[PDB]
Amino acid sequence: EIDTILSTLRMEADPSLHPLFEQFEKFYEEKLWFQLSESLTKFFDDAKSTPLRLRLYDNFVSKFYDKINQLSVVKYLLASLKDSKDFDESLKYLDDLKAQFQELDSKKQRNNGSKDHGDGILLIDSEIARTYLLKNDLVKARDLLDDLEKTLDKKDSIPLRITNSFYSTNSQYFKFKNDFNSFYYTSLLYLSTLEPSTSITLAERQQLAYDLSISALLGDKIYNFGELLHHPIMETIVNDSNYDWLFQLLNALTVGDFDKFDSLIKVQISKIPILAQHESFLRQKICLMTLIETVFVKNIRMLSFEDISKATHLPKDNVEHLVMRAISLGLLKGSIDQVNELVTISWVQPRIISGDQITKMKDRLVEWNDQVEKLGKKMEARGQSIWV
Amino acid sequence: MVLEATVLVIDNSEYSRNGDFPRTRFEAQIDSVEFIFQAKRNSNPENTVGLISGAGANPRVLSTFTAEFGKILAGLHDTQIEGKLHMATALQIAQLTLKHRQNKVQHQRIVAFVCSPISDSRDELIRLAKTLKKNNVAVDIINFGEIEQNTELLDEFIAAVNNPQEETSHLLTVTPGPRLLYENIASSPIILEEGSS
Domain residue ranges of chain A, discontinuous segments joined by +: 1-388
DSSP-assigned letters across all residues of A178-202: T-HHHHHHHHHHHHHT--S-S-S-H
Strand A342-347 to A303-304 pairing: antiparallel
Cα A308 to Cα A19, A328, A345: the distances in Å are 69, 18, 13
Q: What is the 3-state secondary structure (H, E, C) of B109-155?
A: EEEEEECCCCCCCHHHHHHHHHHHHHCCCEEEEEECCHHHCCCCCCH
Q: Looking only at Cα atoms, what is the longest distance across chain A?
A: 104
- A-facing residues of B in 127-186 (CB < 8 A) are 178
Interface contact B27-A111, CB threshold 8 A: yes
Give helix then strand counts, H and E, for chain A: 20, 3
Residues of chain A neighbouring B117 (CB-CB closer than 8 A): none
Residues linked to residue B108 through DSSP beta bridges, in sequence order: B5
Least CB-CB distance to A33: which of B18, B27, B79?
B18
Residue A337 falls in which region: left (phi positive, over 0), alpha (psi -120 to 50) or beta: beta
**Is residue B33 within 8 Å of residue B8, measured between CB atoms?**
yes
Q: What are phi and psi of A288, to 5 degrees?
A: -55, -45
Strand order from edge to edge, sheet including A342-347: A303-304, A342-347, A333-337
In whole angstroms, what separates CA B62 from the centre of its chain?
A: 15
Query: CA A286, CA A260: separation in Å to the nearest integer?
Result: 11
3-state secondary structure of B180: coil
| Residues contacting residue A319 through CB under 8 Å, at least 6 positions apart | A305, A308, A309, A312
Work out the number of other CB atoms within 10 angstroms of the CB of residue B121.
Answer: 9
CA B120 vs CA B8, B85, B129: distances in Å: 20, 10, 14
Strand B48-53 and strand B138-143: pairing?
unpaired
Rounded to a whole number of angstroms, the distance from the CA of A73 to the nearest CA of chain B is 15
CB B170 within 8 A of CB B141: yes
A162 CB-side CA count, 13 A: 20
- Best residue of A112, A117, A161 to probe chain B, by most B CBs closer than 10 Å: A112
Single-letter code of the amino acid located at B195: G
Q: Which B residues 9-28 touch A at CB under 8 Å?
A: 14-15, 17-20, 22, 24-25, 27
What number of C-beta contacts closer than 8 Å exist between A and B? 35
How many C-beta neighbours within 10 Å does residue B131 have? 12
Contacts from A277-280 at CB under 8 Å and sequence distance 24+? A278/A180, A278/A217, A278/A218
Which residue among B14, B79, B178 sits closest to A112, beta carbon to beta carbon?
B79
B23 HSE (CA, 13 A, CB side): 3
A267-282: string of b/e by CB count within 10 Å (b at 16+)?
ebbeeeebbeebeeeb
Burial of B52 (0-12, 13-18, 19+ CB in 10 A): buried
Chain B hits for A32, CB-CB cut-off 8 Å, are: 15, 18-20
Resolution (A): 4.1
Identity of the residue in A32, A34, A113 whose CB atom sits nearest the CB atom of B79: A113
Residue A330, Cβ neighbours under 10 Å: how many? 10
CA atoms within 13 A on the CB side of A349: 15
Size (chain B), residues: 197
Residues in chain A: 388
Give the Cα separation of A300 and B44 in Å (integer).
87
Calpha distance A169→A180 (Å, rounded): 16
Q: How far is CA B187 from CA A294, A349, B29, B44, B144, in A?
A: 85, 76, 16, 19, 15
Nearest Cβ partner for A32 among B20, B27, B80: B20
A30 neighbourhood in chain B, CB within 8 Å: 20
Q: Per the CB < 8 Å rule, is B19 touching A114?
A: no
**A34, A69, A115 member nearest B15 (Cβ):** A34
